[PDB]
Design a protein around this nucleic acid. Structure first.
Ligand code: TTP
Ligand code: SF4
Ligand code: MG
Lengths: 261, 1146, 261, 261
DNA sequence: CAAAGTGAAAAATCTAAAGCATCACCT
DNA sequence: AGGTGATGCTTTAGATTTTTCAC
């Protein structure tokens, strides 16, 4: 059976709060390397990947491989009834349609156990290729959530352009346009505060800002977020959840189609 | 005893007064022996005394002879009902009921009848009931009230010995009038021979069929016009009646006052049409008492046997009766006219016809065109255009010229509306419906259908099933309490939205498989449309293939190009009476609605029994979320609690003393509050699919009744069709002397078939009314679901060729290609029908109907009492084709995934309005801005050779009216401003029944009440016309609803009412434009423009017709996504798909 | 004559905010033994007893037993004008048309007397018995509010079960089946975060969850809530105030019709 | 060519949060001395006056008093993107149809350039003379946030009677007669809780309380609210934005017109 | 006592579920 | 000046009511 035990139970809540707003029905999986999920949205625009490694948990029990088609529109309502600092226990049986969630208080007294019914799902699994990204930016996650929530009031088309001066998040709309520049840190020694950039060639891509708002509900999950992009390649929104795992958000861009030529 | 003797003395006084009233107005008794021929006009249940000194009731039949003489015959009959009995013990219960009602019943006999609800009732098995015949109608009422608690007690018992064995009395609610018309076949508007041979022998009546023409009865059309206090509801306690105008058989007589009327009124001639003429001659009596006296003498001189008016039961007769009771002379003691128990006024000597009781039921008119002044337009084809309604009416009423004009107007219209539409149709009804013309005109359409079925059941010797009652707190199978039980009715979808003209080319996406199967279906389509449509060219067609090869060539030549831009053919494929024809195809009776246990109880449940039709329907139920345990708990706690007393300072009422209606009204509110507080919801809507069988072996009285009425309606419709063809022949040639004759005759037959259509559709509606003898849960839902299946299969067939546009539960509105075949003429050697015109789309739709929707279970008894139940295959569900229309305009909704249903505009080929259905133009009241916009914006939809130019012309009309609504009063006067922004709303109920409920109409009724008295609101049908104010900003619409009756009075009695509900005691402006909510009216017109023009233009790929009206946010998002050069890609397009896996349960 | 005065004037505001949503009208019953409130909700399945002791007031002087017709929604939205620390004084005549309640600040900077129109209705008095209870549980208010607001997301009927292991709050619905388990808390002895039970028989009942949500608006009344429950007796949600009596919510349990009956 | 800089970013955010629900569109008349703003209401009842001088600006550079037609809902959407302590810089060129709202982080790690679109319109102003106001009531805004929105729960049409003892606002409504009274009370003369009434003449003036709730959204903007009124003179509710500026509202007085006149 | 169905627009009000701007302790 | 949970003020999504057309 699948048994997981996580001490800092806040991360799981934020993981689900980051996945409630975007995916109505996702697909989960368990292997020996850890718990991984991979599913898309209804409009086939964003692919979502979350991998939690095995040794990051407090204790991990893996027997076989199970594919779990849980609805994520209802998981963080049976999981919203948890405190942040409580221990989270997940139990999934081998051949049963019940998923068991147990939360334990730090005073070892208040124990909340729940069962959730499971159902079938038909989701296209997509293989992830490895691509050498021409740009990598490592930004604090609060600033990236602030930047997407601030540009969301302007328009829905977001232009992510990085040149040698810095990174530009540009948006335009009926009330005007807004382009915000971020510069590289030089005298900041903190890992969670400094912003670093890696360059091969300056990139100019265009995305959907509503999906960037749906991505950034993982904001206090990690204090930093890594965005890597390349030409005609979907952008990645990598949230490095401590040493526990990582959360990747794949975003299909908007390039100009040469309709005349 | 003594009180019963004086009651009989009062009834004998009533009878002698009635016969004296009859003898005053003609109507002599048949005291002399002999034989007389008479045309039956009137019936009423009155009492009579025979030779045995017994007071019994006798319907006083009134007849009109050919020479003009009239007479009255009181046929004595004994009123009755039927009683049921548990077993064969029938003599002891009869003796027990005879030995304690020895002075109040007449005779008891055992009556064999057939009832529809018995198991095994088709083998020749009858259930024998018992007649109990009494002496008077009051005897019937008293014995019915005495023995009616035994009905409820013996029904509730389910687990003086000769008294409790009775199951259930039958046919007690049937009137003695209706009963005596049913029993001896004495129907109105027939010719009879009346033979009297003394008082000992009863008077004998026989039908006479050799005479078929109708006589000319004296028809009176009076209507009054009274001055009043300014802008008040009609009350007779203020002043008197100015004028009564009344016609005598196409000759109008008017009597006027002189002491208040200024000018001595001279004579004139009214000529609305050559058909409608009144040769007037006016009288000028000086006093109002002499006015009513001259009216009494002229009615007594003329002796009218039919008397018609405008709103006699509501305005006119109460006003004249209150005036008569003031002046001393009694309306009853003069002309028979007293208010009866229902508020209708029925003379014993005459006929009362309110034209509104025909218009509001049978005319199929909008309620906004229900008064006489607008039903004249819709029936007589003329408009009273007299004067302005304000200046020459509200303060210049001293002008007797104008007053007499209006008086003659309110009399010619009601007289000729009667003679042309109400007289022949209502007496053609009265020939089959067993009721007097007052009851035929006044009862509901369901009651008319019940009466027709009651004649057919008595002719088939079928006992009348008992009038069911509305069950309270019905329970769902799981246990929920049903708020309302419904079926899923007709299937309405609006598929496309926009203007579809036949002169603009539109894109078709037909698949070639449709034409591939149509190529082999052509021979069947033309054979079926030549056989089943007209029976005469069955095989006598000469050029059967000489047009069929051209049809196949035309159908297959443009099959090679399926995708094609071409002009369309706007075709209405309408079914003719689809609800009666589905009933007539499937033998759908509410008696025939049968279940599995009742079929298993039958003896004809053969293994190869071709006698069950298993068509399906969609049940629908809204129920409370509270369960059965909660229902039992709240019922117990309500039983424990004591109720307030009904009587003032009376004893307290428990649960078992209250009635079921009071208990249900308590439990509904007390459970709805618990549901809202404990379940977040009150009504859970569930749609369920269920199928029940139809017994095809059953008695066909319902099928025969609907077939007889459909044959009557189709006789009138065939007359309408041949006169429409005569009009089509008389058009496109020069004008002649018969074109107006053809037009008025086809209008009369269209009105006649609509008036018969109302009863014919009320045959379907009758199985779903409270208090129905033939109620059926299943039947009406089955007929609606079958019509839904028919129209959705027609949509499936059309969508493979062209584009279906508006699906209702009537037919398909669609566009078909121009190269599709059309109305072609077929020659035939028969002299009666040399040429037969047949359209192709109706033909292939009729072949789809013949292949799928035909009925091979049509067990019909060819010879009765021989079990020769042969089976036929009759369809009769035909898709009549309306002609290729010029255009069709459909609106669109303001939200995603929704469309405006039951709403479109269709124009005929000459640019005229063919259909304008569902809009707010024809609706009663509404905003006159919306009415003017929707009536003027569709004439511009025919202007333009392309969609952009068409939408530009429509935008020009809309922008012009928006520029008016924005920069109001550039040159636009205040009077037409006042009569432009008014909104009229009417309530069915009283204002005291609208307590603790907030609405604009309720608020302006309360405003009118606290303005000028509650006597405007104590009566129902209140018409309140108002505006929505804005001066208390932040208040809702209900708190800013303000009537228009406060901008007409004096400033000293209008400034207080201006400062009260505007929440501003310091205001000074008297202009309406400051008070008016400009933003609210801008939003209303903008929503109308968005529904008609701009959103359908976005769906037909036009940018924006009206730049002033903005788009909804979803449409703006879709337009911005389509406009820009950037595009959305997919992860499935960018990254390679690994493969679609399946994740199952663990 | 009516004169009353209490320094800790927030308690009236808390009990009126707790009684605003459930009951619409009430009857203030006055005596020398104790001041009684006895009102029923609009659905007539919940009974309310609010008792304020006479000696808990600083100044109290009443001459006879009086009845008062009052709607508690108007009384609650007129009592919410007071602060959290102002001193309340109550005043009335024998048969006046107004109820006088005055709020004075501790520094006398804001003296605020409120006069409202009473409504004369039928004053119904139903003497309920203080029946002995099989199970009582003295547990914090915020924890019970958390239990109700967490079970409201998953279901609509709460199966409250108690035994020697402690107390249990279960639910079921379209999301799944969950339960919250609390033990005896005998290892620690705290003055506010203690869950102490007293049982003569382990009895379980089912209750209405939105009614429990309306009941737990009396969370700032006290940090200790006594739930009293027995078989075929209504649940008593007793909030004990210091030297001011108690406020009890009575809820009829769903004793459903047994299938074997 | 016009620029301005503020280290304080919360002032413009709070002056847009308190003004969006009153006025939909207003014209900013920024002069060389500072930011002035007269604003008529959408329902044409009130006038709002702002006076922000250049002494609190970081750098000020204005040449001509330009009138910019800034839509308040759009600007409050865009000024939401500014931080609470972030540096706000607004820039306008000579032929700029747009308004360049630039936000700087306090860490000097971001530049957030927003171009908001402007449309041109012309209105007229009438000004206001200087009078002698009889009753000036300085009073803490945090208590007005508990007085006005709780007096509006019981009555709309309230009167303001003033005297030497203090000021009384009397709430007449369906609920009853609601009297609050505040005196001088200089026993503990605190700096911010100083209810001072400058009394010259007793005036009774009637006002509406939905409207008076609509100015009271500026309570986090200031620390105390002073309001001055006189005999048939419009009321001026004023707030003090630190040492930056002041925010004034012009309420036209409501007079209960007698039936006999 | 009499009273033909259902579908649907159109608007107006009544509720509750979220979205989002401030308070109950610790360096 | 940063970390958790309530608590109240707008905003919007449906639910419900009532005339009055369609079928
Ligand atoms: C108008 C109307 C229709 N209906 C139902 C019955 C009809 O079969 C169906 C459509 O009626 P209609 O198409 O309006 O009329 P019809 O089909 O009976 O005859 P025709 O088309 O030749 O004019 O709607 C009613 O039940 N009651 C009504 O008042
Ligand atoms: S349908 Fe057939 S089996 Fe059923 S009752 Fe009729 S005849 Fe008998
Ligand atoms: Mg039809």
């Amino acid at each position: 059976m699948f048994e997981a035990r996580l001490v800092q139970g806040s991360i799981l809540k934020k993981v689900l709060e980051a996945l409630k707003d975007l995916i109505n029905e996702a697909c989960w999986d368990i292997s020996s390397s850890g718990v991984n999920l991979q599913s898309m949205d209804s409009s086939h625009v964003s692919l979502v990947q979350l991998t939690l490694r095995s040794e990051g948990f407090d204790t991990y029990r893996c027997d076989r491989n199970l594919a779990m088609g849980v609805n994520l529109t209802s998981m963080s309502k049976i999981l919203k009834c948890a405190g942040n600092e409580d221990i989270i226990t997940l139990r999934a049986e081998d051949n049963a349609d019940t998923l068991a969630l147990v939360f334990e208080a730090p005073n070892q007294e208040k124990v909340s156990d729940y069962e959730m019914k499971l159902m079938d799902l038909d989701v296209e699994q997509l293989g992830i290729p490895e691509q050498e990204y021409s740009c990598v930016v490592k930004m604090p996650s609060g600033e990236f959530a602030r930047i997407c929530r601030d540009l969301s009031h302007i328009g829905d088309a977001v232009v992510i352009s990085c040149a040698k001066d810095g990174v530009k998040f540009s948006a335009s709309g009926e009330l005007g346009n807004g382009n915000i520049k971020l510069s590289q840190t030089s005298n900041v020694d903190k890992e969670e505060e400094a912003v670093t950039i890696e360059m091969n060639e300056p990139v100019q891509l265009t995305f959907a800002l509503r999906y960037l708002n749906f991505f950034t509900k993982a904001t206090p999950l990690s204090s930093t977020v890594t965005l890597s992009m390349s030409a005609d390649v979907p952008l990645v929104v990598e949230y490095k959840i401590a040493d526990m795992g990582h959360l990747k958000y794949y975003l299909a861009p908007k390039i100009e189609d040469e309709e005349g030529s | 005893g003594a009180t019963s003797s004086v009651s009989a003395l009062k009834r004998l006084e009533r009878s002698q007064w009635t016969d004296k009233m009859d003898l005053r107005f003609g109507f002599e008794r048949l005291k002399e022996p002999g034989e007389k021929t008479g045309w039956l006009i009137n019936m009423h249940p009155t009492e009579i005394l025979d030779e045995d000194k017994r007071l019994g009731s006798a319907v006083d039949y009134y007849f009109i002879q050919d020479d003009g003489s009239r007479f009255k015959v009181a046929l004595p009959y004994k009123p009755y009902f039927y009683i049921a009995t548990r077993k064969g013990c029938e003599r002891e219960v009869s003796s027990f009921l005879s030995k304690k009602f020895q002075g109040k019943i007449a005779k008891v006999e055992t009556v064999p009848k057939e009832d529809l609800d018995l198991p095994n009732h088709l083998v020749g098995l009858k259930r024998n009931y018992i007649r109990l015949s009494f002496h008077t109608v009051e005897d019937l009422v008293k014995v019915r009230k005495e023995i009616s608690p035994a009905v409820k007690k013996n029904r509730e018992q389910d687990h003086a010995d000769q008294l409790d064995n009775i199951v259930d009395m039958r046919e007690y609610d049937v009137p003695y009038h209706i009963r005596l018309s049913i029993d001896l076949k004495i129907h109105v508007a027939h010719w009879y021979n009346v033979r009297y041979r003394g008082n000992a022998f009863p008077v004998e009546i026989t039908r006479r069929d050799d005479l078929v023409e109708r006589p000319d009865p004296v028809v009176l059309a009076f209507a009054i016009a009274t001055t009043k206090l300014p802008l008040k509801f009609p009350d007779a306690e203020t002043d008197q009646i100015m004028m009564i105008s009344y016609m005598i058989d196409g000759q109008g007589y008017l009597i006027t006052n002189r002491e208040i009327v200024s000018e001595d009124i001279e004579d004139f001639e009214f000529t609305p049409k050559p058909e409608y003429e009144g040769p007037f001659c006016v009288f000028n009596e000086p006093d109002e008492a002499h006015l009513i006296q001259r009216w009494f003498e002229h009615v007594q001189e003329t002796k009218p046997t039919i008397m018609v008016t405008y709103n006699g039961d509501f305005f006119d007769w109460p006003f004249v009766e209150a005036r008569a009771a003031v002046h001393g002379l009694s309306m009853q003691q003069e002309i028979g006219f007293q208010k009866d128990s229902q508020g209708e006024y029925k003379a014993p000597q005459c006929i009362h016809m309110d034209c509104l009781r025909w218009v509001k039921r049978d005319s199929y008119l909008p309620v906004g065109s229900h008064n006489l002044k607008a039903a004249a337009k819709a029936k007589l084809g003329y408009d009273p255009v007299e004067l302005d309604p304000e200046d020459m009416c509200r303060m210049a009423t001293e002008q007797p010229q104008t007053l007499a004009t209006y008086s003659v107007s309110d009399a010619v219209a009601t007289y000729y509306l009667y003679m042309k539409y109400v007289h022949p149709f209502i007496f053609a009804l009265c020939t089959i419906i067993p009721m007097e013309p007052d009851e035929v005109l006044r009862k509901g359409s369901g009651t008319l259908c019940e009466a027709l079925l009651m004649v057919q059941a008595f002719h088939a010797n079928i006992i009348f099933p008992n009038k069911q009652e509305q069950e309270f707190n019905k329970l769902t199978d799981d246990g929920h309490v049903l708020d309302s039980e419904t079926y899923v009715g007709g299937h309405v979808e609006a598929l496309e939205s926009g203007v579809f003209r036949s002169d603009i080319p539109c894109r078709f996406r037909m698949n070639p498989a449709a034409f591939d199967f149509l190529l082999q279906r052509v021979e069947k389509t033309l054979r079926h449309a030549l056989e089943e449509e007209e029976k005469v060219p069955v095989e006598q067609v000469t050029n059967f293939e000489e047009v069929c090869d051209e049809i196949k060539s035309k159908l297959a030549s443009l099959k090679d190009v399926p995708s094609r831009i071409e002009c369309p053919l706007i075709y209405h494929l309408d079914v003719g009476a689809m609800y009666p024809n589905i009933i007539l195809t499937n033998r759908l009776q509410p008696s025939a609605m049968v279940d599995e246990a009742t079929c298993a109880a039958c003896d004809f449940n053969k293994p190869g029994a071709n006698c069950q039709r298993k068509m399906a329907w969609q049940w629908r139920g809204e129920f409370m979320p509270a369960s059965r345990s909660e229902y039992h708990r709240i019922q117990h706690q309500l039983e424990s609690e004591k109720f307030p007393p009904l009587f003032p300072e009376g004893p307290a009422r428990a649960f078992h003393e209250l009635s079921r209606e009071e208990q249900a009204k308590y439990e509904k509110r007390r459970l709805a509050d618990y549901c809202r507080k404990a379940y977040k919801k009150i009504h859970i809507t569930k749609v369920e699919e269920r199928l029940t069988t139809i017994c095809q072996r059953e008695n066909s009285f319902y099928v025969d009744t609907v077939r007889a009425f459909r044959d009557r309606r189709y006789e009138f419709k065939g007359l309408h069709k041949v006169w429409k063809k005569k009009l089509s022949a008389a058009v496109e040639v020069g004008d002649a002397a018969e074109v107006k004759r053809c037009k008025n005759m086809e209008v009369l037959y269209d009105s006649l078939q609509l008036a018969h259509k109302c009863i014919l559709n009320s045959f379907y509606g009758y199985v779903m009314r409270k208090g129905a003898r033939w109620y059926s849960m299943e039947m009406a839902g089955i007929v609606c679901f079958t019509g839904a299946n028919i129209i959705t299969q027609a949509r499936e067939l059309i969508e493979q060729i062209g584009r279906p546009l508006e699906l209702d539960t009537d037919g398909i509105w669609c566009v078909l290609p121009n190269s599709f075949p059309e109305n072609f003429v077929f020659k035939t050697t028969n002299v009666k029908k040399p040429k037969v015109t047949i359209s192709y789309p109706g033909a292939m739709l009729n072949i789809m109907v013949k292949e799928g929707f035909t009925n091979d279970q049509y067990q019909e008894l060819a010879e009765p009492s021989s079990l020769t139940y042969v089976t036929r295959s009759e369809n009769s569900i035909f898709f009549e084709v309306d002609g290729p229309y010029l255009a069709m305009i459909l609106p669109a909704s303001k939200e995603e995934g929704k469309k405006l249903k039951k709403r479109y505009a269709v124009f005929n080929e000459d640019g005229s309005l063919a259909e304008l259905k569902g809009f707010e133009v024809k609706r009663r009241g509404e905003l006159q801005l919306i009415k003017i916009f929707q009536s003027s914006v569709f004439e511009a939809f025919l202007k333009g050779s392309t969609l952009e130019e068409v939408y530009g012309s429509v935008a020009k009309v809309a922008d012009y009216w928006l520029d008016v609504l924005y920069s109001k009063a550039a040159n636009m006067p205040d009077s037409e401003l006042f009569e432009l922004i008014s909104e009229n709303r009417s309530m069915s109920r009283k204002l005291e029944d609208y307590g603790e409920q907030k609405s604009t109409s309720i608020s302006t009724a309360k405003r009118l009440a606290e303005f000028l008295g509650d006597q405007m609101v104590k009566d129902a049908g209140l018409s309140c016309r108002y505006i929505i104010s804005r001066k208390p900003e932040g208040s809702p619409v209900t708190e800013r609803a303000i009537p228009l009756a406060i901008f007409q009075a004096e400033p000293t009695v209008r400034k207080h009412f201006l400062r009260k509900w505007l929440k501003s005691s310091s205001l000074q402006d008297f202009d309406i434009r400051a008070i008016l909510d400009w933003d609210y009216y801008i939003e209303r017109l903008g929503s109308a423009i968005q529904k008609i023009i701009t959103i359908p233009a976005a769906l037909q790929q036009v940018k924006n017709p009206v730049p002033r009206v903005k788009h909804p946010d979803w449409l703006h998002k879709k337009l911005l996504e389509k406009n820009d050069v950037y595009k959305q890609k997919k992860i499935s397009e960018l990254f390679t798909l690994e493969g679609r896996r399946q994740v199952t349960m663990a």
